[PDB]
Amino acid sequence: LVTSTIKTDVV
Amino acid sequence: CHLSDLLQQLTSVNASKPSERGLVRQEEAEDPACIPIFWVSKWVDYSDKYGLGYQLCDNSVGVLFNDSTRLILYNDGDSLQYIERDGTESYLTVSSHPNSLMKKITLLNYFRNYMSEHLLKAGANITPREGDELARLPYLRTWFRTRSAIILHLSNGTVQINFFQDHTKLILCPLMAAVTYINEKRDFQTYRLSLLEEYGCCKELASRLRYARTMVDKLLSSRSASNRLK
Ligand code: NI
Ligand code: NI
Ligand code: NI
């Protein structure tokens, strides 16, 4: 909600 | 700034009741040739402090700072575009940059690092066509949030809508008159809005196209001439 979708492309 | 045409396009499709047909033929509206070159792959809302940072699918990054200036770093790792409040735009580089952009470039860097280590690239598995070059790359003109979504307006006219709950997305482009839907499984398809008017579409897409109209409507009315205070 304050950042987008998390987890770990491509600089 | 092709927002007016988009509104006219969305109004048209929504008024045709695409989901209220004898037989819905959404598959015949697919047009894979209309896939957008650009969309927003990552974002960070630090608007309490500094602004909104984002990555485009071509790996370029941008920040719309709170003072309404914009800084864009191209994927060449050196080219910079700065866009002032009035829209003027300067092109420059990181190696020979003005000392005056030191703060803003450093901030872009901070945003960039946060997003490589913790955010996912929306649409990461799509293979770009040769060129993907042009045009000067789009920058973020404006953005806003609702209870249900974040709304991102790019300078090439595209309007992107990310729904928070289900991670589904719309990429609307008014020149091609097309819409890209990213579903719950992250699959992508592009439809011509005019063929959706013609053949209809599923309730999943239709509801979202109705929401898109109201959101596009909010963009046009923002600081418009009827009420510059909004
Ligand atoms: Ni420097
Ligand atoms: Ni962390
Ligand atoms: Ni979820």
Which residue in B47, B60, B119, B147 has the most chain A C-beta atoms within 10 A of its own C-beta, making it the best mutation to test that interface?
Answer: B119
CATH number of B1-40+138-230: 3.30.1120.30
Say whether B116 and A6 touch across the interface (CB within 8 A): no
Q: What angle do CA B49, B103, B80 make, to 5 degrees?
A: 110
Say whether A5 and B45 touch across the interface (CB within 8 A): no
> What residues of chain A, 1 to 11, have a C-beta less than 8 Å from chain B?
1-11
State in Å: Cα A10 to ligand 2 middle. Answer: 18
DSSP string, chain B: --HHHHHHHHHHHHHT-TTSSSS--GGGGB-GGG--S--EEEEEEETTTTEEEEEETTS-EEEEETTS-EEEE-TTSSEEEEE-TTS--EEEESTT--GGGHHHHHHHHHHHHHHHHSB--TTTT--PPS----SS---EEEEEE-SSEEEEEETTS-EEEEETTT--EEEEETTTTEEEEE-TT--EEEEEHHHHHHH---HHHHHHHHHHHHHHHHHHHTT-SS-TT-
Domain with CATH 3.30.1120.30 in chain B: 1-40+138-230, 41-137
- Give B41-137's CATH code, choosing from 3.40.50.300, 3.30.1120.30, 3.40.50.2000, 3.40.50.2300: 3.30.1120.30
Record the resolution, in angstroms: 2.5
